Amino acid sequence: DVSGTVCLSALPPEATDTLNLIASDGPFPYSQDGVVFQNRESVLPTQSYGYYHEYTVITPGARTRGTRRIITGEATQEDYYTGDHYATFSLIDQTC
Amino acid sequence: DVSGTVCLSALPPEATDTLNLIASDGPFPYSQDGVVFQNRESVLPTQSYGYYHEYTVITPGARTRGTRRIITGEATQEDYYTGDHYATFSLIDQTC
């Protein structure tokens, strides 16, 4: 289940950076940006393989790619945020 | 992010000195000159560890290394100036 909706203004600033890159189709910072997200634990609605893609939300100060990501679906504005390495997800509302 | 591009002629003259030292591979005035810049805060573009190196830009009259630095990237002509101790950066244009 999606844990609720979250305003874009409420997320770390880097979430806005990632969304802008998704909009332009990069170029992206990490080679893993844009890979298919398999939704193995069925946290997000069940879809055919390939429906979902994942992108890094940079965490300043981290030594790795970290745990923050944006998962996109095929619907318009269907963008989900996870700050906990896919445990929980929120749908992003870009109007607030 | 990078703030914009600045002509070398518009920076303190000590920046010109540091670039000249970088071109000749020293010798450098400070032992910290040439160490890897980790870009821990992700202000500059994400790159592999060792892509960036830091060099002192002398501040006239200072007893310490001060706050001015040039950060080199591995790409041709990729050099960044900071006058505020890595808070903000501008790309150096050596052609003007």
Q: Which residue has the tokens 């560890």?
A: B49
CA distance B51 to chain A (A): 14
B20-26 contacts at long range (C-beta below 8 A, 24 or more positions apart):
B21/B55, B22/B55, B22/B70, B22/B72, B22/B79
CA distance A60 to chain B (A): 5
Q: Total structural domains in chain B?
A: 1
Q: Is the peptide bond before A27 cis (omega within 30 degrees of 0)?
A: yes
Q: What is the phi-psi region of residue A67: left when phi exceeds 0, alpha when psi lies from -120 to 50, beta otherwise? A: alpha
User: Resolution of this PDB entry, in A?
Assistant: 1.2
Q: How many residues does chain B have?
A: 96
Two structure tokens written together for A1: 């289940």
Whether residues A58 and B40 touch (CB distance < 8 A) is answered with: no
Q: Which residue has the tokens 């970088």?
A: B22
The strands making up A79-82's β-sheet, listed across from edge to edge, are A5-7, A90-93, A79-82, A69-72, A53-56, A35-36
Whether residues A60 and B45 touch (CB distance < 8 A) is answered with: no
Does any CB of chain B come closer than 8 Å to the CB of residue A27? no
Size of interface A-B (CB pairs under 8 A): 12
Q: Which residue has the tokens 């600045």?
A: B6
Does any CB of chain A come closer than 8 Å to the CB of residue B42? yes
Q: What is the CATH number of the domain that holds A87?
A: 3.10.450.30
B59 touches B68 (CB < 8 A): yes
Q: Is the peptide bond before B27 cis (omega within 30 degrees of 0)?
A: yes
Three-state DSSP at B9 gives helix
What helix, strand, coil percent values describe chain A, rounded to 5? 15, 20, 65
A54 is catalytic: yes
Residues 6+ apart with CB under 8 A from B92: B5, B6, B8, B11, B15, B19, B70, B79, B80, B81
Q: How many residues does chain A have?
A: 96
Provide the 8-state DSSP code for A46: P
Expressed as residue numbers, the domain containing B22 is: 1-96
Distances (CA, A) of B16 to B8, B35, B56, B62, B79: 7, 19, 11, 18, 12
Considering only CA atoms, which of A50, A51, A84, A52 is closest in space to residue A69? A84
Q: Which of B41, B45, B46 sits opposite A61 (nearest CB)?
A: B41
